[PDB]
Amino acid sequence: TRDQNGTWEMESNENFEGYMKALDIDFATRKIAVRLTQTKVIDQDGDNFKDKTTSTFRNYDVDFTVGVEFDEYTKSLDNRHVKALVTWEGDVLVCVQKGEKENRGWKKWIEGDKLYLELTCGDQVCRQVFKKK
Amino acid sequence: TRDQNGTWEMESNENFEGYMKALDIDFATRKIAVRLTQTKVIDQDGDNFKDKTTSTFRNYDVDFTVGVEFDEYTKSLDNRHVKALVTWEGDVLVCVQKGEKENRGWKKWIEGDKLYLELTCGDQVCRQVFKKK
Numbered sequence: 001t002r003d004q005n006g007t008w009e010m011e012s013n014e015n016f017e018g019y020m021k022a023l024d025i026d027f028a029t030r031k032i033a034v035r036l037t038q039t040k041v042i043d044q045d046g047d048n049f050k051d052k053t054t055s056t057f058r059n060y061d062v063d064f065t066v067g068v069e070f071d072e073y074t075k076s077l078d079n080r081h082v083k084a085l086v087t088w089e090g091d092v093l094v095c096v097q098k099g100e101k102e103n104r105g106w107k108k109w110i111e112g113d114k115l116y117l118e119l120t121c122g123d124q125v126c127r128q129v130f131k132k133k
Numbered sequence: 134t135r136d137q138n139g140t141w142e143m144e145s146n147e148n149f150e151g152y153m154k155a156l157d158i159d160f161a162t163r164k165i166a167v168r169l170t171q172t173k174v175i176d177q178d179g180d181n182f183k184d185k186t187t188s189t190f191r192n193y194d195v196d197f198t199v200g201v202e203f204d205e206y207t208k209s210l211d212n213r214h215v216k217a218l219v220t221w222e223g224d225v226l227v228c229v230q231k232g233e234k235e236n237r238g239w240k241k242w243i244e245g246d247k248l249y250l251e252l253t254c255g256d257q258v259c260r261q262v263f264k265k266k
């Protein structure tokens with residue numbers, strides 16, 4: 001078939017590094033690129049093609065109900081089991097992940113059109129700010 | 134407020150390295166992660182949350198008509214101009230990218246539920262396989 005329409009998810013990628021080196025793509029970029037999954041969206045109508053390639057490293061999906069403890073396997077992060085509980089403290093959503101790691105959890109809250117997330121583990125704190133699309 | 138619904142685009146990310154290290158995420162993995170932009174999709178109904186964070190690197194878009202030569206600027210790849218021409222050889226879609234690099238182009242074809250993409254540049258060949266979602 002000549003019909004290449006569809007949404008296509010990468011299954012394998014052989015010698016992407018060699019090809020990128022031939023193009024002179026910088027080292028930093030290649031090191032990232034080889035690790036990414038790619039998704040390809042092809043819109044084909046007769047002889048007209050629109051091709052969109054997107055690259056992704058890892059996803060993280062978590063579902064929870066506030067006030068309901070749950071077993072959480074942090075797959076594709078550090079791969080541990082923790083007992084997670086998310087509760088409200090004012091308008092701050094607060095998560096504690098009980099497990100091997102001390103002081104593990106997070107805080108997530110809104111101010112104006114921005115979302116603030118503070119991730120904690122051990123004595124380390126990571127602070128992230130998101131803007132609404 | 135407590136409504137955190139929406140699609141959220143990361144604006145900044147402080148000490149992500151510190152946090153991943155405390156989690157014992159491996160060095161190479163940390164170095165890729167710190168570079169990527171994240172998008173957070175939150176679906177909230179009352180106290181029920183579904184959270185999906187996606188880490189992404191680059192995108193590449195190209196539109197063309199089979200048989201019509203066009204100037205391709207490879208923005209976000211090697212940032213060069215090639216005169217690209219895409220043609221059919223049987224059921225294989227074949228592009229030649231004429232410019233500075235020799236043997237530059239690609240081939241795309243369907244076999245079953247799979248899409249095959251061979252990318253070439255200089256003495257290098259990259260082979261990719263995609264499955265329809």
Ligand SMILES: *C/C=C(C)/C=C/C=C(C)/C=C/C1=C(C)CCCC1(C)C
Nearest residue numbers: 033038051053055191192193210239
């Ligand atoms: C017909 C479909 C084509 C030619 C798809 C081409 C996609 C690439 C040549 C991949 C480009 C990327 C890199 C070279 C590194 C950054 C990540 C990508 C996937 C955008």
